[PDB]
């Protein structure tokens, strides 16, 4: 944290944050969500971290260089240490990235090494070559060298993500899956795990061995797993929660803006809300069926007359404000709803869905007030504009992720946030073989468009290829885009250090501080 001159700091430096739900795990190679990443950034640190405005900055690596965007060399700081006092070395990174690539780890982010194009990743993922073949090497204890199969100019932007953080081999190898219990875990971030009570709380305390420990101000931070946005708000305003999760209740939002406007933080966020269609499950494997759902959805009612929290109606997957996105707006987005409905009714009828035989399916969402209210309004618009019957089903977070990876769903509420600010952070998730592809979308035409972006050394053709890739997804109606998020949350007036400037919202509790109040 960088405390301004003249700020008076409270005597007790502790913070309570709501985190939306119970995390799927504390192991960085086993996580895929925002709740999981919020806690991971405070425990495990990788080569680069984000500064308070979101820019990629030095983490364990003090400096780095590249040769042709293909060979990247990271010089690790000599005082980086684990919480048990042992040093963080280049060998930790070699071990960790081979463990992430290893099919046996079954990481939901296995494909993040493909996004980066580390040499040999495809064969390692496919079981053809051992993980030890990965293109990474420790030249010495403090120099980590990475070799790509192609020039990737934005490569270092990826490195702030939890998946490429280091894991302590000795604990992983001694305790297996219980290496993350408070008694066994070893961490290299600003905090260490003090307590973990499933469905109650996660308590972290400062890690004294952290190399930048002298700038850490908060000594203890608690993460709560409350998935009810109304409860998060009540407990914030009663004084128990200092920072809500960034899901706001439709029930109270307008009233909070009126009553505690200074506490309501609303900033740009690179995330898209959408309904994920299982592309492999009949009748969703029919493009007319997906296109009808996409068209009959009235975004103006949902975004502006139902949620009304500042989001923008979406027509694409990648948010249009992502760095390097130059998207073309589809013409159906330009039509009236009336024309969209007529066309939707027409396509559904071509697929064999009459009034005598309505299309019926389930809409799965992760337990939440906000997602339930939105699913009820959407089930209702689809009923009214298309005559389809929708069954709403809620699942707790970690189970809901599981269901989607397995493909046992029809339609699911979804929301992807960027891991790095470049259009492939979104587009790579739709690759046929991506481990993050829960749409189960497989398109060789889409896959080839993304492959070509790294075969050109021109940012205008790359952008033109990203816009054609969004157009291919749109043509296939792989998903139903709803809105581009605004990051809305409540932050007590005594929480300093949160600018709201990072569009990826990569918050580190080590940068925050409590003002005396």
């Amino acid at each position: 944290a960088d405390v301004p001159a003249g700020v008076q700091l409270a005597d007790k430096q502790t913070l309570v944050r709501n985190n939306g739900s119970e995390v799927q795990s504390l192991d960085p190679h086993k996580i895929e969500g925002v709740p999981e990443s919020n806690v991971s950034r405070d425990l495990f640190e990788g080569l680069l971290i984000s500064d308070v405005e979101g820019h990629p900055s030095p983490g364990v690596a003090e400096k780095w260089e590249n040769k042709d965007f293909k060979v990247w060399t990271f010089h690790l700081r000599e005082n980086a240490k684990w919480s048990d006092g042992t040093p963080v070395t280049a060998h930790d990174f070699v071990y960790s990235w081979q463990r992430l690539a290893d099919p046996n780890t079954a990481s939901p982010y296995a494909s993040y090494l493909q996004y980066g194009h580390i040499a040999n990743i495809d064969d390692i993922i496919a079981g053809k070559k051992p993980a030890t073949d990965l293109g990474v090497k420790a030249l010495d204890d403090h120099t980590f060298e990475v070799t790509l199969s192609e020039p990737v100019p934005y490569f270092y932007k990826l490195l702030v993500h939890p998946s490429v953080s280091p894991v302590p081999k000795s604990a992983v190898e001694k305790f297996g899956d219980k290496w993350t219990q408070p008694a066994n875990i070893v961490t290299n971030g600003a905090y260490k795990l003090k307590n973990w009570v499933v469905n109650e709380r996660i308590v972290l305390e400062r890690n004294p061995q952290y190399w930048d420990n002298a700038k850490t101000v908060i000594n203890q931070v608690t993460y709560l797993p409350i998935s009810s946005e109304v409860t998060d708000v009540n407990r914030y305003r009663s004084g128990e929660i200092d920072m809500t999760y960034n899901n706001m209740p439709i029930e109270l939002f307008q009233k909070l803006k009126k009553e505690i406007p200074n506490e309501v933080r609303v900033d740009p966020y690179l995330c898209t809300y959408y309904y994920e269609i299982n592309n492999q499950k009949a009748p969703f494997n029919d493009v007319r069926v997906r296109t009808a759902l996409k068209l009959a959805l009235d975004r103006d009612i949902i975004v502006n007359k139902v949620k009304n929290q500042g989001d923008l109606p979406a027509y694409s997957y990648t948010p249009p404000y992502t760095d390097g996105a130059k998207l073309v707006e589809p013409e159906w987005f330009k039509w009236s709803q009336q024309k969209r409905n007529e066309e939707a009714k027409k396509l559904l009828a071509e697929a064999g869905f009459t009034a005598d035989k309505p299309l019926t399916f389930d809409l799965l969402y992760n337990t939440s007030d906000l997602h339930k209210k939105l699913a009820i309004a959407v089930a209702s618009i689809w009923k009214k504009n298309l005559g389809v019957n929708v069954n709403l089903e809620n699942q707790e977070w970690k189970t809901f992720l599981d269901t989607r990876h397995q493909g046992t769903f029809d339609v699911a509420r979804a929301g992807w946030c960027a891991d790095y600010n470049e259009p492939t952070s979104f587009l790579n998730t739709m690759l046929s073989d991506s481990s993050n592809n829960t749409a189960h979308y497989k398109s060789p035409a889409f896959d080839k468009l993304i492959a070509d972006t790294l075969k050109v050394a021109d940012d205008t053709q790359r952008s033109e290829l990203y816009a054609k890739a969004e157009q291919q997804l749109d043509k296939d109606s792989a998903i139903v885009p709803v809105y581009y998020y605004v990051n809305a949350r409540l932050v007590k007036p005594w929480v300093g250090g949160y600018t709201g400037k990072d569009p990826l919202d990569n918050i580190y509790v080590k940068n925050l501080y409590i003002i005396k109040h």
Binding site: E32, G33, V34, C271, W397, L401, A414, W416, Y485
Partner: peptide
Amino acid sequence: KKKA
């Protein structure tokens, strides 16, 4: 990352 998947946003809950």
